[model samples]
Target: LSDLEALRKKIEEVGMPEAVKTKALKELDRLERMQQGSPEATVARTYLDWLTEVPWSKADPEVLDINHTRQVLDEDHYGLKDVKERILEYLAVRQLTQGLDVRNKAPILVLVGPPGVGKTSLGRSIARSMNRKFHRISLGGVRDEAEIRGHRRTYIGAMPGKLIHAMKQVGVINPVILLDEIDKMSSDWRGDPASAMLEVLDPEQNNTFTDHYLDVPYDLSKVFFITTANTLQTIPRPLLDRMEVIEIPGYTNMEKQAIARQYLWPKQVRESGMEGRIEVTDAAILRVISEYTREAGVRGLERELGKIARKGAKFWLEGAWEGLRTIDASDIPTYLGIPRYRPDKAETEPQVGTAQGLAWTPVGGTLLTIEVAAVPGSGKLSLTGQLGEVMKESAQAALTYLRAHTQDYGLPEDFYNKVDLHVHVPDGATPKDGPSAGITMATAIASALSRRPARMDIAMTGEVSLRGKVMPIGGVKEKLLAAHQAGIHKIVLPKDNEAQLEELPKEVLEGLEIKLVEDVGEVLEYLLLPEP
Candidate 1:
C-alpha cells in the first residue's frame, strides 16, 4: 500500500497532465481494494508503473549551433549534402526562435532510398549531431495495430506502445526516434499499423499524443522522429503526408571509391584483425567496386573488402612470411576470382537497327539496347523482351511516331505498309517497362528502315509523342551516372530536362556531349549514321 502511494505521488510530482494524474489515482484506488498478488491487482500496478517510468518533464538541452551540427554530419557521412543542409536549416530555425515554440516545429524528416544506402546510419548521425539520445523501432513486416497504439489495459501482459516504450528506454522525452523500413509494413485482421502512425508523426497532434495502455496524453512534440523506407509507393498516403521526405540517392562510382577507402576499408581491416598487416590501395578498391560488385551503394563493396581481409588473415595464419602484403588491381584476380560484372558498353559491335537506351531501376540506372528489324510482310509490329504493358504501348507509339515522320528522314512514304517491324530490348528474361525508352525504340526503327546504324557511343532516354515530339523523362541523374560509367560520351535527352542538368554532379557531366532535343528529328541527326 505504501509503495502504491509512492507511485501516485511520483506521478503527480512529475507534473504529468491532469488526465494522467486522475487515471493514476483511480488505478491506485483499485489496487487497494483488490487482493494482493491477484492478476487484476498486478495489472493495475503494471499500468501505474508505466505512467511513472515515462519521463513526463525531462528533456536534454537542445544544441542550437548550425556550424557544429553541419560539421558533425559531414564528418560522419561522405555525401547527402542536401540532407545535411536541410537539417542545418531546421537547426537555424530553432536558433532564431531561441528554443521557444516546440509545437510549431517541422514534421518528421523521412529519408527515402534503396537498401544499403546508409538510411539507418544517417538517423544515428542526426541524433549525435543534435546531442540527443537515439532509439530505433523497425516497422518492417509489422502488421498489428496494437504494436503502434499499444494494447488496452484489459489485455493480458499489456504494455505501452513502441513510442512510449522508446520514451522509457531512453529515459527522456526528446530523444531522436527512428522508424525504420516503414514501407515493408503489412496489414491484416489485426488492423492497420500505418494509420496508427499518423498521430505519432503529426506535430500538431503528437503534442497531445495518447497511448492505449498509458491512457494519458503525453507531449511528443519535443521528440524528433525520423523515418526511412526503400520506396514511398507502399506507404499510406495519410501517413506519408505528415513527413518531410528527403531523397538520399545512391552513391556514384567515385563516391563509392572514396567511401571504401575512408570508411569501409579501415573498418573491415580492423574487424578482420588485419590492421598493419595488409595494404589495400585505392586502385584495388576501385577494381572491387567496378568488377566485383554492382550496386548503387557501398554495401556490396564493403562485403567484397571484408572478403579480401579474411583471405589475407587466412594467408597470415598459414605462416606466409610476406612483409606488408600489397593489394593492387593486379592482385585482385588472385584473392577474388574473375570479375563478376563487366561494363555493359561495347559488348557488341554497332549495327543497323540497334540503339542504346538508358533506364532507371530501384537499384540504380541501367543501360539497355533496343534492337529493331524490318522485313517485307504485311504491315505488323511485334515487340518482345518480356515488355510490360506501358513499354508495349511505348513501342507502338514509337512506331506510329516514326511512320508519321518518315518524309522528314527521307524515307519511303509507303514503308510502314510494306515493312514488318519487330522491336526487341535485349536481356529477354528481364521485364522492361516505362515510356522513357520511346525515343530509343523510334531511333532503332528508323535505323532499321534506313539501313543506317545507330551510334554505339550515344545513348538516349525520353518519351516520344505521336506527333514526333520528345517528352521529358525522370531519373536524369541516375541515368547520366550509368551512362558515364559505361563510357558513353554522348547522350540525347528532352529539352525540358536540360535545366535539371545542374542537379547532377559535375563529375557526371564532365567530358560528355549532352544533346537536348525537342523533337525526334533532332535525335535522328545524332543517332543515325549518314546515308551511304
Candidate 2:
C-alpha cells in the first residue's frame, strides 16, 4: 500500500510535471475503484496504495566496484559462498549483456534461502550495488489468482500483481522486484498463482505483458524479478523451472558472531538512540551469539541485540549516566531474559528399532530417525508419519530391496514374508517425503527384524533405485550441515554424489569424514558391529 504513496510522493518529490503525475494518479485511482468490486477488494486497496506510493524516476544509482560488492555481502551474512558466486555470475552476465548502463536490463538474481536468511535485505544490497530502485512484496499465503496476475475489468480495483505494479510504480521498465515467501503461496480450483507468475518471469512473454488494469501491453523486459522461497517443493515445477535458483545457506557460528558485533549491535544501538553510550565489543557479541542463538540467520542475534539496546536506552531515558559504554555476555541474558532459539541437537538413540539419516531441507540439513517395528500379521505393511508419496514409495522400495538382497545384508529371505512391518519417521507435523531416505528406511527395518544395532555416528541419505543403484539427491550442503549439527562424524552418501563435495565450501567439509557408496553392503560395513 505504501508503495503507491511512495510513487505519488516520488512524483511530487521530483519535479515530474504535475499534469503527467496527475494523469497517472487519476488512472491509478480509477483502477482502485474498479478493484473494490472484485473478490480481492482488500488486496486491491493495498495494491492501489503501492501504486501511488513510490517515487518514480528517483531511484538511487548502483555502485559497481567489486570490493564494495564483496563488503556489502559479507556485512550481511557469512558462509554463503554459493550464493556469492551466483551473484557474481549474475553481475558478470549483466555486464556482458548491458555494460555500465545502470538502467540496463539485468537478469534477476533471486536469492532463495530458508526463513530469516536475509532474502529481502539482499534485494536492498543488490539495489544498492546497481543503484536501481528496490521494491519487495511479501507473498506469504497469497492465494488469489487475480492478486498475482491482476483482475479483469469485471473486477474492482483491478491492478496487476507486484510485477506489473512495480513497473508502473517505478515509472520505469527496470527495477528489482523481490517476490518474498514464494514457497508458501497457495492455489486451488479458483486459479493457479504459479501459472499467473509465468508470463511475468518468462523472458519471451514478459516483454509484452498485458495487464488488465493497464489495458495495454507494457514492456517489463527491463524489470528484474527475484524470488525467495524456503523450499522449492511447494513451488510449482514450471514456475521454479524459469528461475535460476541460487541457494543461500545459513551463516556459520563465526560469521553470525562477526555480523552481530560488526553490524547488528551498532544498528540497534543507534536506532534506539543510545549510540555513544553503548558499545558491544566483538568478544561480547560472540558470547551472546554462541550462548543465545544458533542456526543460519541473525534474526535471533538481532533481536537479542535489540533487547540489550532497549535496556540501555531505558537506563539513558531514566538519566542513569556513567562511563560504561559496553555490554558483555554476563549482562545480555538478564536484559533479554532466557534465550528462545533452541535447535534440536539431541543425540541419536540408535536402538534395535531405528537408524539415523540426514537429508537437506530449505532450512538446511536435518537429522531424521527412521524407526521400524514389526509383528506377525497377514503380511501387511503399514507406514506412518506425515509421509509424502515419494517417501511412501521409498519405504516400499526399501522393503523390496531388503527382500531381494537378504543374503547380502545378512537377513533371511523369509523375513519379509514372515513379518508384517510398520515403519515411521517422526515429526508428524513436518511434511516428510522424499526418496533420499530410502536406504535409511530399509536399513532400519532390516536391523529391527534381525535385532541388530545400526551404526552410531554414521548417517546416510540417497534414493535407492530398484536395481540396487544409489541415486543422487539435492541439497547436499544443507544435508551435510544437518549431519554436522547432529554430531555425526561420518556420513555415507551415494557414490554418484561424490562430485557434490567439490561444490561445497571447505568450511562445510572440514573436520568430517564423508563416505560415498553404491550399495547396501557398503552401508552394512558401516552399520552393523563386527562379527561377535
Candidate 3:
C-alpha cells in the first residue's frame, strides 16, 4: 500500500503537472540513463531537446477563384495560350477539391522553359491569383542537404531549413513557395539537394517530415510549392516525378511585338514618369524584334524599349516633345543605335555552295544551310559544322541512300563510285545534330553532283534512313515558324505530321505553304531538275 501511494505521488509530480514535467522528466531520464550505454543515452537526450522546439499546428488555406486566376495571369503577361489554359486547369482541379483544406493536399507545380520566358513571373502571378503570401526558396546553387532538411544540433548556426524559416516568417504554415532554378541544383561529396528534395516534395512523406533540428513532425501539405527549371535534363528523375510540369515555350516575333507594345513599353514609359508622352508605333516594335533583337522571348525587345523610353523620358524632362505620343522606326538608330542583327536568309547572288534547311530545337525552330562540295580524293567523305554523332551517321546514310536510289532519280550509277563528297552545315559555332536533316543533306548533295542548284527559297526537313524511308520528327510548328521567318514560301515535311499542322498558331501558318510527303521521291518531284 505504501509503494502504490509513492508511485501515484510520482505520477502526479511529473506526468500531470506542466511546470514540473520538463525537470521531472529530465531527472527520470538521467536516472534511467545509468542502465543504458553512454553514447545511446546522450543521443536519446539530444533528440528529446529537439522535439518540442518546432511549431506543428499552424496552417493557412489557399484562396483561388477561376476568374481571378485568369485575370491575374493575363494581366501579368501576354501571348501564352497553352500556359494560361494550364493555369486555369490547375485552379479547376483545386476548386473541385475545395474544403479539403489546401494545407494538407496542395501539389507542386514545376514550370519548364527556356531562359527569360517568364517562368519566375508566372509563379508570382499564381501566388497573387490565389491570394497567398509568396516566398522564394531558390535552389540554383544549393549544395548541402543540411541546407534544405536542416542540420543536426551538432552544427553551429543550424536552425530549421529555409522551408521552416519561411513558414515562421509568414507566421502561418501555408504560403506559395517558389523553388526557382531547381534544374540548376548542384551537389558534391557532401550530399545532393536534388535527391533530398524528393522527400520534401513527395506528397505522402512530406506531410509530417521531421527535420533534424525540429525533430517534431511538421505538416507541409498546406504549402503551395512551385518550382521553375530552364530544362528538365539536369533535374534528377525522382525529383521530377513529384512535380506537375508546365512548359512555357519561347515567344514568337508577333508575340514579342505585342508584349513590347502592351506590357513592357507602357511599364517602362510610366516608370520614367512619361506616361502620356511617348507613342511607340507597332512598326517600330516590329523593327526592334526583326532587326535589333533575335530571341525566343521579349527580353531583347524589353531592353530596346527601355532604351527608347530612356531617351523619350530625357526629351520630356528637357521640355522637347513633352506631350508628344509617337515614336517612329526612324527614331530607333538615333536612340538605340543601328540594329544589332540583320538576318540574311540567302546570298544576294546565286551560290553553288549551300542549300537552306529548316529544323526545330528546344530553343525553337531555325533555318540552317547545308554546303556540299566536290573535292579531288579517293572517294573520301568528310563532314563538318560541329555535327553530333547522330547527324554524322545521318549524313553517311543520306549519301549511301542517294547512291542506291540514283536510278529512280534518273542519275547515272557511275556518279557515286567516282566522286568524293564533302558536306558541312554553316555556323560552325552552333553545334548541329539530329536525323531530320537527312533529306536535306541528300537533296543538297544530289543538287551539287547534278550541277543543279536547289531552289533558293525552298526549305525542307525529314529523317532519311539508309533505305530512303522518310521518318516523322517533332516540333512541326517551330519548323514552320522558322521557314516563314527565313522567307521560305514552301516547306517539305513528312506526311505523317500533317495532323500536327492544326496545332500550330494560325498566324504562324498564314502565308506559309506545307508540302507533306510519304517518301523523298515526292520532294524530288518539286526540287530536282528534269532528267537530261
Query: Best lDDT goes to which candidate?
Result: 1
lDDT of 1 by residue, 241-306 (tens): 767676666666667677777788788888987777788888777677767766667677778788
lDDT of each: 0.73, 0.65, 0.66
At residue 422, candidate 2 shows an lDDT of 79
Global fold similarity of model 3 (TM-score): 0.79
Q: After superposition, how far is residue 204 of candidate 3 from its true place, in Å?
A: 4.0
Q: Is candidate 1 or candidate 3 better by lDDT?
A: 1
| Leading candidate by TM-score | 1
Q: What digit string (tens of lDDT, one per residue) describes model 2 on residues 1-532?
A: 4655565565456544454456456646654675445544454444444335533344345456765787776655453556666777776666666654544433354556665576677877877776677887777776776676656643455666665555556655567777777777777646666665676666557656555554434555556677777776677776666566666665555556566666677789779876578866676665665456555466766887788888888866777566556666667667766755333333344557677777556676566777877887767677777656676688787677767776766556676577777778875523235576778887787678767766667787778867767878866767776675454557887678788778876766766677888876677667755310
User: Please, what is the TM-score per model?
Assistant: 0.84, 0.72, 0.79
Which ten-residue region of model 3 has the weakest summed lDDT? 47-56
TM-score of 1: 0.84
**Local error of candidate 1 at 507, Å?**
1.9
What is candidate 1's local distance difference test score? 0.73
Per-residue lDDT of 13 in model 2: 62
